[PDB]
Write a protein that binds this ligand. Structure first.
Ligand SMILES: C=C1O[C@H](O[C@H]2[C@H](O)[C@@H](O)[C@@H](O[C@H]3[C@H](O)[C@@H](O)[C@H](O)O[C@@H]3CO)O[C@@H]2CO)[C@H](O)[C@@H](O)[C@@H]1N[C@H]1C=C(C=O)C(=O)[C@H](O)[C@H]1O
Ligand SMILES: C=C1O[C@H](O[C@H]2[C@H](O)[C@@H](O)[C@H](O)O[C@@H]2CO)[C@H](O)[C@@H](O)[C@@H]1N[C@H]1C=C(C=O)C(=O)[C@H](O)[C@H]1O
Ligand SMILES: C=C1O[C@H](O[C@H]2[C@H](O)[C@@H](O)[C@H](O)O[C@@H]2CO)[C@H](O)[C@@H](O)[C@@H]1N[C@H]1C=C(C=O)C(=O)[C@H](O)[C@H]1O
Ligand code: CA
Ligand code: CA
Ligand code: CA
Length: 404
């Protein structure tokens, strides 16, 4: 059994009294709903308030989310309930605290008394000319424009980041990683850190453009999109690796599908169309996250159909990830908990078998492991499609779930 939970949103750093402190009061509801892993925000000092422009990595006390003692208390509470803690690891880029003689911010400070992470421009990809001194290796991946990109090919960098990562586990108690902007460095570099730190899981955020047509909607065929993600997993180590990816293919397709285009939820081979359909064990599915949803709203799930999104990911193969706001602030807490209970009670896992029974514009009906049937869509009556022996156990706006 495995169900992830994003424990924050874009506005979290603003929480009165501290985000982690408030989260102590949410622990029991999260665990009781069947969540196994909670993804927490970048915990270090950041030039930006949300944490994605990290500087002094060991300086946890400078985080807008709360200090090291407050974070420890939270993870301890999650552990007290059998819930693991995932840390958002932002290492593609980093901000240096001080300017060098060129007037460039490239003198880094790790946050400890000695020199760990006290890097200089030699650790910045030479092709990131805005900050480098031209001496480093070329970036192994994409560049993050607003900050110095790190040369993960550098010996000291790999050594010190790995040391920092092991510390996040030993000192704070973190169990796993969420690899931010994994497009920024090669899967080979991600393998160093994953293999080198033994996280329970390491979910990579590789987010690439999804092909669309003249009308702005994603093409029905998204194989190129999931192939890219599958390729990342293969390169990082495949089945043996703790590495996996967020299923952005499923997110993009589902976004469109629920607007009466449920025929999009099956590929020509009869499989789910997202990463879920090719490598379910490595597909972390979701309805929205802090970028796509929340206040950034980069690619929000149709607001009036969010529960169809959960009825879908919570009953299907792949590892579902619930978003904080959807659980506590949209009034779906009991419905979402009920869906997780059905998943768990039926032994459904990331590798369960999926048999799609109907895939028409306004009606998607699928059967999982021959034990659960789920339906989403504006079409009310799908009774004729329901196999004998099944009876409703959960239902809501345009969705219903059956059990034997
Ligand atoms: C059991 C059904 O559950 C789901 O239907 C929702 C529906 O989408 C909502 O819009 C809402 O409809 C209610 C209206 O709000 C109300 O004004 C009206 O008077 O009554 C309707 C019906 O309650 O609520 C329902 C219930 O949550 C789901 O989308 C739908 O497909 C599903 N029906 C299926 C299950 C059965 C066994 O209980 C069969 O009887 C049906 O044939 C089967 O399609
Ligand atoms: C905020 C995200 O931006 C990028 O994703 C873009 C995709 O590449 C593009 O295909 C799509 O059309 O638009 C996306 C949104 O701009 C990055 O690839 C992605 O990693 C990034 N999300 C994380 C990175 C940050 C910088 O550290 C943060 O601002 C985000 O909050 C992260 O979740
Ligand atoms: C399970 C496999 O998933 C991916 O393969 C997909 C291909 O990339 C895609 O082009 C093809 O059409 O569909 C495939 C999915 O059916 C990975 O590339 C592939 O490596 C992976 N197979 C590995 C995983 C295992 C456990 O799931 C092992 O038993 C296999 O031997 C691995 O090769
Ligand atoms: Ca130092
Ligand atoms: Ca950069
Ligand atoms: Ca990079």
């Amino acid at each position: 059994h495995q169900v992830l939970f994003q424990g924050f949103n874009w506005e979290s750093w603003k929480q009165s009294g501290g985000w982690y402190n408030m989260m102590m009061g949410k622990v029991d509801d999260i665990a009781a709903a069947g969540v196994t892993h909670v993804w927490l925000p970048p915990p270090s000092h950041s030039v930006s308030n949300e944490g994605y422009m990290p500087g002094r990595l060991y300086d946890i006390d400078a985080s807008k989310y709360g200090n090291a003692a407050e974070l420890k208390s939270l993870i301890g509470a999650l552990h007290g309930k059998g819930v693991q803690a995932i840390a958002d690891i932002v290492i593609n880029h980093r901000c240096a605290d001080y300017k060098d003689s060129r007037g460039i911010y490239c003198i880094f400070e790790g946050g400890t008394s000695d020199g760990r992470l006290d890097w200089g421009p030699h650790m910045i990809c030479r092709d990131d000319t805005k900050y480098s001194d031209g001496t480093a290796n070329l970036d192994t991946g994409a560049d993050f424009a607003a900050a110095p990109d790190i040369d993960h090919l550098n010996d000291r960098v790999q050594r010190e980041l790995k040391e920092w990562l092991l510390w996040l586990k030993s000192d704070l108690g973190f169990d796993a990683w969420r690899l931010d902007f994994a497009r920024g460095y090669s899967p080979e570099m991600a393998k160093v850190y994953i293999d080198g730190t033994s996280p329970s899981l390491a979910v990579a955020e590789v987010w690439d453009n999804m092909a669309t047509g003249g009308d702005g909607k994603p093409n029905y065929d998204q194989d190129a999109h999931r192939q890219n993600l599958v390729n990342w997993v293969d390169k990082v180590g495949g089945a043996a690796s703790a590495g996996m990816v967020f299923d952005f293919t499923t997110k993009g397709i589902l976004n469109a599908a629920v607007e009466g285009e449920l025929w999009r939820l099956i590929d020509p081979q009869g499989k789910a169309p997202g990463v879920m359909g090719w490598w379910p064990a490595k597909a972390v599915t979701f309805v929205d996250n802090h970028d796509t949803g929340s206040t950034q709203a980069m690619w929000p799930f149709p607001s009036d159909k969010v529960m169809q999104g959960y009825a879908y990911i919570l009953t299907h193969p792949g590892i579902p990830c619930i978003f904080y706001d959807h659980f506590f602030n949209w009034g779906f807490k009991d419905q979402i908990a009920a869906l997780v209970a059905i998943r768990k009670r039926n032994g459904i896992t990331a590798t369960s078998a999926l048999k799609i029974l109907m895939h028409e514009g306004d009606a998607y009906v699928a059967e999982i492991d021959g034990k659960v049937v789920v339906k989403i869509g504006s079409r009310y009556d799908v009774g004729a499609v329901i196999p004998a022996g099944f009876v409703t156990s959960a239902h809501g706006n345009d969705y219903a779930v059956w059990e034997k």
